[PDB]
Amino acid sequence: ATYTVAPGDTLYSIARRYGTTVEELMRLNGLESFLLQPGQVLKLPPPPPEPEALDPESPLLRAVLRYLGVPYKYGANSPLALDCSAFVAQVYAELGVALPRTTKEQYQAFPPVEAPRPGDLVFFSFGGKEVDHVGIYLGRGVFAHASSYGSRVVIESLEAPFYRKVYRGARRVMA
Amino acid sequence: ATYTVAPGDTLYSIARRYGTTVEELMRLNGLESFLLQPGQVLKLPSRERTHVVAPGDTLFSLARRYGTTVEALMRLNGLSSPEIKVGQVLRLPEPEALDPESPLLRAVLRYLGVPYKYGANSPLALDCSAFVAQVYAELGVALPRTTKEQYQAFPPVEAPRPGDLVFFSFGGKEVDHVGIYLGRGVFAHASSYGSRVVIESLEAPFYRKVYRGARRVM
């Protein structure tokens, strides 16, 4: 019937918790803005499990964020297939985890995890031929990698059609 | 040349400072990994410098011009006397932005990977702008719901600075998509694939093509 907004709550989190939508929640409360102060009482029209997710202050994310939007070129005129696995190694280096240079080695050296969790490496076949691209899974179906566009570091969705197609599996490198 | 590793230093950060690549930096030092202890001493690449002796030049004058002695400049070139002739070749010795600790970026990162679906059956043109309004709600700025309203109700800006709303026309008919420009030419938005929030490059061919300008709400 009624919900009282707790600190950190959002219209998204509340709508999702009670199996409705932000729209319905705004309509039924006559809200015209997404602004939400603690103690605010919202009318409402079995809590679902929470996806594992990195913290904005996590060592893994902070490392990724340092390079976010920055092109990561391994050598003078190095190909993307080298840049992507060199970026992955560089991030993990900031965490004390040594990693092999090449995407291939990274793929073969580590044990396969069927459903990846925050920290695992996800691999793809861009050219179709072989596993030739790698990124760092961040949780919630997104991963960080050096992209085709100038090897700039970006965060994209694993559940995009292109990536679902070029997908090649995940590997574990930490605990 | 020589550099000693400080805590928090990386191959990338070191290569950048001394104007070289991570690849060469590893090869030259026989590194088997990117792992770098703060007690380490990495050999830096040395650049080759030559000088063709012009009229008026002497070994004493060239010594103080490049930062060396006449004796040092003599060994390197295998001379016995300070004699150089005109035309002789002498060897000679020897931008970012993003801040994780930021109100705007703290809020954005809160939604990474989240499928921000505003309604039960809402279009991406609505999802993306609801998301933008959602992030700014945590920064005390009340924005409209729709893309169309965020587009034509705020001052247009030539180039975008972090925070500004970047607009696109995925459809072609009208402006129907919006994101939050973060800096370094990347923007946060609800993606077409599943309304998932991602952070993509503004400089990708497609987005550079369907770009429709930037607006300032702050």
Residue numbers in the entry:
A (entry chain A): 17 to 61, 117 to 246
B (entry chain B): 17 to 110, 122 to 245
What do the authors say?
LysM domains, which are frequently present as repetitive entities in both bacterial and plant proteins, are known to interact with carbohydrates containing N-acetylglucosamine (GlcNAc) moieties, such as chitin and peptidoglycan. Here, a structural study of the Thermus thermophilus NlpC/P60 endopeptidase containing two LysM domains is presented. Glycosidases, such as muraminidases and glucosaminidases, hydrolyze glycosidic bonds between carbo­hydrate units, while peptidases, such as amidases, l,d-endopeptidases, d,l-endopeptidases, l,d-carboxypeptidases and d,d-carboxypeptidases, hydrolyze amide bonds of the peptide stem at specific positions. d,l-Endopeptidases belonging to the papain-like peptidase superfamily possess an NlpC/P60 domain which is responsible for their catalytic activity. This domain is commonly associated with PGN-binding domains such as the SH3b domain, choline-binding domain or lysin motif (LysM).
The P60_tth structure was solved by the single-wavelength anomalous dispersion (SAD) method using selenomethionine-derivative protein. The final model contained two molecules in the asymmetric unit (chains A and B). Analysis of the crystal packing with the PISA server indicates that a stable homodimer is formed within the crystal. The catalytic domains dimerize via a surface area of about 980 Å2. This dimerization interface involves 17 residues mainly belonging to strand 8 (S8) and helix 5 (H5) of each monomer. Two salt bridges are established between the side chains of Arg223 and Glu230 from each catalytic domain. The interaction surface between LysM1 and the catalytic domain is 593 Å2. This interface involves residues in the vicinity of H6 from the catalytic domain and residues from H1 and H2 of LysM1. In summary, the SEC experiments indicate that P60_tth is a homodimer in solution and that the catalytic domains mediate the dimerization. Overall, comparisons to known NlpC/P60 structures strongly suggest that P60_tth also functions as a d,l-endopeptidase involved in PGN hydrolysis.
